[PDB]
Nucleic acid binder design. Structure first.
Ligand SMILES: Nc1ccn([C@@H]2O[C@H](COP(=O)(O)OP(=O)(O)O)[C@@H](O)[C@H]2O)c(=O)n1
Ligand code: BEF
Ligand SMILES: [Mg+2]
Length: 505
RNA sequence: AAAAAAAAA
């Protein structure tokens, strides 16, 4: 399929698009009432193309915290006004996202447009997301008969394989927010299933639907991955970023804290926070990322016993009930201060206003997710910083980050923990030995799955991680007790590394 | 065992 690039011009505004006749009046009052300084560079660049009379797809790219949501959300409402008479009781646009909380966020943003103009409520919206009651959603779908659907791939398929002919038979638009992630292995087959059904069911033709791709991390390789879900002949790559320019935002003051062992990053983080609390007199809003659910829960337990007196500590990951997930996302959105301890569920898309800095103990599940992680701060013209707490074996990450992502940390700092602090932390650990083992084993699993990606040294990285088990009990010489059946189940029985991390007990 | 992702996740 045809593909054209349009790098970064004359300014565009709300009023302007009102004169050009590309945007209806009822939509103008909505964004106008929000009282923004003006349209984001990406929003100016993308809005008119999407409504173009030409049959074409788009793969826009813009840095984090730069109104990419409204950048596609506004055209939807425009197209919905331009077709209010034809098939009013049918879905005309489907938005897909990697995480549940993000899909609900995009919905909440549609609900903001509805608040800035009651005349737009006619174009109802429903979110089709896992974790929520299935029957209730369909009941809401029948009642409201929405024109906009916002879903997660899994739940969407469940609905599509049961109620396609009823609602999704006249879809005209299809949005992939965080497109790259949605085109990765594990989501690509799901998306190809979404696309195929919508195109097979579309009343006009199997190429009627136009596709919109959005993300802070994109190149031309995604067009190849998306070639199976893109129906139009021509495709427009709108980029508000130079080719070699870092995809990471420039307003982010990035730093990295290198350390001897892995466990020492925990002590480093607590020290950074403890300092940042006293230095800001509480009044501190931060997000702390971790590589594992079990280590997230563990890390949260530490910060509770350490900082619960000063700030609230919020645990956030996939093993938390969806009710609680939604609940805490709401709170942290309006909370002036607090520590959000989370996995990579909160890496992409999620918008928490005025978060001072982003912390990272370890590495993300994806190289690209580093750009998305620090992207949680410095949003909407705001400022922010980011600390990366790693050890002396995770440098290939920082290196590979420089090679590929074209991102290097300006501020490098070494760290070694004092003795007085280890006592403070290692005393505040209610976890039993058997439980601690599960926390470590999970980190080993985690860090092995990204040795190829991050160019780690399986030889020296894996033993260093597993050695944390000794540290947490204050016995470095000690190893993790495990049966010969499990050790062999890992496959490390063939490697010398196996004996360097475990003990057959 | 390992981050996401459907009413068995
Ligand atoms: N023209 C605009 C667009 C968005 N925003 C704000 O930017 C916040 C988040 O932007 P976003 O998450 O949609 O942008 P991305 O991070 O997806 O690129 C929103 O809550 C809006 O309030 C704005 O101030 N002005
Ligand atoms: F949604 Be963007 F990546 F902050
Ligand atoms: Mg976004």
């Amino acid at each position: 399929s045809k593909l054209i690039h349009v790098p970064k011009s004359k300014e565009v505004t709300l009023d302007s698009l009102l004169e050009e006749g590309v945007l209806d009046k009822e939509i103008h009052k909505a964004i106008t009432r929000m009282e923004f300084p003006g349209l984001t560079p990406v929003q100016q660049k993308t809005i008119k193309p999407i409504l173009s009379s030409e049959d074409h797809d788009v793969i826009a790219r813009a840095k984090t915290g730069t109104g990419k949501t409204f950048a596609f959300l506004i055209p939807i409402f425009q197209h919905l006004i331009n077709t209010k008479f034809d098939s009013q009781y049918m879905v005309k646009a489907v938005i897909v996202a990697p995480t549940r909380d993000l899909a609900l966020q995009i919905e909440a943003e549609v609900k903001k447009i509805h608040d800035m103009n009651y005349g737009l409520k006619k174009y109802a919206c429903v979110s089709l997301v896992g974790g929520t009651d299935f029957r209730a959603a369909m009941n809401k779908m029948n009642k409201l008969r929405p024109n906009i659907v916002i879903a997660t791939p899994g739940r969407l398929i469940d609905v599509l394989e049961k109620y396609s002919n009823k609602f999704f038979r006249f879809v005209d638009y299809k949005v992939l927010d965080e497109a790259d992630r949605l085109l990765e292995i594990g989501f690509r087959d799901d998306l190809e299933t979404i696309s195929g059904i919508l195109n097979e069911k579309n009343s006009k033709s199997a190429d009627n639907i136009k596709t919109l791709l959005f993300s802070a991390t994109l190149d031309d390789k995604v067009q190849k991955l998306a070639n199976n879900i893109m129906n139009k002949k021509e495709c427009l790559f709108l980029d508000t970023v130079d080719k070699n320019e870092p995809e990471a935002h420039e307003r982010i003051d990035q730093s990295v804290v290198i350390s001897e062992k892995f466990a020492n990053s925990i002590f480093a983080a607590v020290e950074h926070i403890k300092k940042q609390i006293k230095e800001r007199d509480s009044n501190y809003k931060a997000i702390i990322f971790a590589p594992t659910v079990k280590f997230t829960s563990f890390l949260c337990s530490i910060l509770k016993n350490e900082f619960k007196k000063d700030l609230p500590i919020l645990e956030f990951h996939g093993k938390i009930t969806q009710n609680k997930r939604t609940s805490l996302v709401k709170r942290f959105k309006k909370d002036e201060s607090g520590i959000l301890v989370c996995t990579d569920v909160g890496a992409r898309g999620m918008d928490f206003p005025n978060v001072h800095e982003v912390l990272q103990i370890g590495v993300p599940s994806e190289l690209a997710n580093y750009i998305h992680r620090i992207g949680r701060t410095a949003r909407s013209g705001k400022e922010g910083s980011s600390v990366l707490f790693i050890c002396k074996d995770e440098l290939p990450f920082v290196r590979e980050l420089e090679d590929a992502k074209n991102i290097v940390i300006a501020k490098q700092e070494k760290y070694e923990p004092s003795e007085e602090i280890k006592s403070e932390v290692l005393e505040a650990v209610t976890e039993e030995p058997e439980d601690i083992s599960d926390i470590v084993i999970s980190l080993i699993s985690s860090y092995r799955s990204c040795i190829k990606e991050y160019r780690f040294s399986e030889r020296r990285i894996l033993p260093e991680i597993a050695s944390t088990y000794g540290v947490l009990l204050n016995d470095p010489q000690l190893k993790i007790p495990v049966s010969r059946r499990f050790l062999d189940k890992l496959g490390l029985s063939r490697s010398p590394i196996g004996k360097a991390m475990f003990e057959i007990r």
